[PDB]
């Protein structure tokens, strides 16, 4: 009867505890009692938030160490629902959950996994890099990367769907931010644990919706070559289609591109969607998030503020509802 729901790409190979890395990986459970504690090992500066009976609690970190943290306490004695959310992205380190403790209380039967499922594929925007920063000149701060208030997570909660957030700040299709060497998105996409080489079994999570927001890094400094960019994008779509033949795929642009980088990326992604559509695959769509204009502020290094994430989520929720007929 009692058990735990692991929402995300988790590796269960170590009997000492499940491991994960991607943004928004989360552990969901019911417990009886008045408090709950967890022991977490984290490879780098990871931040977490507990949401208990629908109340988000102050976030906390576990930084390149193993810590036992009392997540919540002083509750009325009874049954309670807990989501434990990894705020921070994969590059800030893998996380292993080494056990929960309920004091005098006990673990209850887990909620069932949600039937509606979304996979997001993206960069800093999807990671919600800097969304709790307060001005665009501020540099990255692990504590301010709140993926629970990413446009992705908000949209998933709007739709009562689970989401896997396969995203990595600075990553592109043809190049990484500023030409930085290293794996590109297709290189990292096949992994559960991108630093320790554990590959994901795609049959384990088949989403009805895939949301792709890539290309900001391909156009934010140097402009990627059109053929190279279009070919990389079609290759990603092919891989998604290989694992999820029936998914509805939303190809997104915005809201951080501007000027000619925005014009080119928009044009190229539109062309990719148009090409798929003329090829008979009618379940590939284009979405544009209007460029941010300062009126909802900026997060660190120009990345979207929570307010901008909420606008994006409003728009993406409507697009998904339209195409899937959800709600
Ligand atoms: O987790 C850590 C992670 O970091 C990754 O690298 C980060 C990198 O460290 C950051 O410096 C970088 O920051 C840049 C943004 O990516 C980029 O989008 C942004 O572009 C700005 C630009 O600087 C600014 O001039 C531009 O202004 C235009 C306005 O937007 C228009 O409204 C107006 O009309 O015209 C002006 C142009 O005149 O705006 C854009 C945004 O729209 O510049 C940031 C640097 O200042 O981000 C990277 C991640 O996204 C690293 O790669 C990872 O490896 C590492 O782990």
Numbering used by the authors: 8 to 334
Tell me, in the authors' exact words, what the paper reports.
CE2 enzymes are acetyl esterases (that are generally not appended to other catalytic modules), which are reported to be active on synthetic aryl-esters and acetylated xylan. Here we report the biochemical properties and crystal structure of several CE2 members, both single-module CE2 enzymes and CtCE2, a component of CtCel5C-CE2. All three 3D structures reveal a bi-domain enzyme in which an N-terminal β-sheet “jelly roll” domain (around 130 residues) is linked to a C-terminal domain of approximately 220 residues. The C-terminal domains possess an atypical α/β-hydrolase (SGNH-hydrolase) fold, consisting of repeating β-α-β motifs that form a curved central five-stranded parallel β-sheet, in the strand order β2, β1, β3, β4, and β5 with strand β2 interrupted by loop insertion.
The structure of both wild-type CtCE2 and the S612A mutant were determined in the presence of cellohexaose and clear electron density for five β-1,4-linked d-glucose molecules was observed in the cleft, consistent with the affinities revealed by ITC. Notably, the O6 of Glc-4 makes a hydrogen bond with Oγ of Ser-612 (in one of its two conformations) in the wild-type esterase and Nɛ2 of His-791 in the S612A mutant, while O6 of Glc-2 interacts with Oɛ1 of Gln-780. Mutation of His-791 to alanine reduces affinity for cellohexaose ∼20-fold but, intriguingly, the S612A mutant binds to the oligosaccharide ∼8-fold more tightly than the native protein. In the wild type enzyme Ser-612 adopts two conformations. In one conformation the hydroxyl makes a polar contact with cellohexaose forcing the ligand away from the histidine. In the S612A mutant the hexasaccharide adopts a different conformation in which it is now able to make a, presumably more productive, hydrogen bond with the histidine. Indeed, the bond distance between Ser-612 and Glc-4 is 3.3 Å (the two conformations adopted by the serine suggests a relatively weak interaction with the glucose), while the bond distance between His-791 and Glc-4 is reduced to 2.8 Å, pointing to a stronger interaction. Indeed, the kinetics of inhibition are consistent with the observation that cellohexaose binds more tightly to the enzyme when it makes a polar contact with His-791 rather than Ser-612; when the serine is in complex with acetate (or formate in the crystal structure) it is not available to hydrogen bond with the hexasaccharide that is now able to interact with His-791.
